Amino acid sequence: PQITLWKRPLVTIKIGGQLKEALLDTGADDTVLEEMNLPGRWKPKMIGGIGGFIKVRQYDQILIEICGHKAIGTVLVGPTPVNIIGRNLLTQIGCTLNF
Amino acid sequence: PQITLWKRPLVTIKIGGQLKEALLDTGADDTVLEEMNLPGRWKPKMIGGIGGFIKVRQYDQILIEICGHKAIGTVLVGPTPVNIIGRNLLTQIGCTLNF
Ligand SMILES: CCC(CC)CN(C[C@@H](O)[C@H](Cc1ccccc1)NC(=O)O[C@H]1CO[C@H]2OCC[C@H]21)S(=O)(=O)c1ccc2c(c1)CC[C@@H]2O
Structure with a gap:
């Protein structure tokens, strides 16, 4: 699909047998x-960003499904205010930026 | 252009007459x-990020050119770890996610 950015690019993902909402980031x-x-x-x-760092647990070779597209890679788990799908998985589902 | 995500989507921006590098975020x-x-x-x-909240200076209606594409919008200036171009300007240059 094509996702415009008027709103946050949130999508349903499946990980550890659970469905969640996450940002394509x-x-x-x-x-x-x-x-x-x-x-x-x-x-x-x-891991650091705006405001400082948070402590996370790094899991490897975790299977994630993103909009029906399967991917497997590193997942960092911690007190993040939002679920974030990063480039390590976006490359695997074929995601590009276009303008 | 079409931009893959195997590397950080860094681009050159022009703001206030100065060239800088920024991350398409x-x-x-x-x-x-x-x-x-x-x-x-x-x-x-x-503004709040992954690690908490920071104080920024908010500049409204600022001219900013991103990889040759002109935008005029809000730019926050402050102790971010990295120059980031967010959706308020990504929408102006016609940027979409595609997979
Ligand atoms: C370094 C560049 C950038 C941070 C400047 C990296 N971030 C990703 C970026 O999209 C965040 C995502 C987000 C965080 C919290 C809440 C909502 C959205 N948005 C962000 O802060 O947005 C600002 C400006 O607009 C406002 O809207 C949203 C919040 C405000 S991260 O989350 O800090 C991160 C992620 C993975 C990883 C790291 C760091 C380090 C290692 C690991 O790979």
């Missing part, structure tokens, strides 16, 4: 999801 | 630039 290198109790091992990480 | 409602001198009156504003 070209400004995020990687993907950051709201606190969830995912199974498996993880590594601690600190 | 679909996850940003607003455009926020690092500290700079801008010709124009301004108003104190707050």
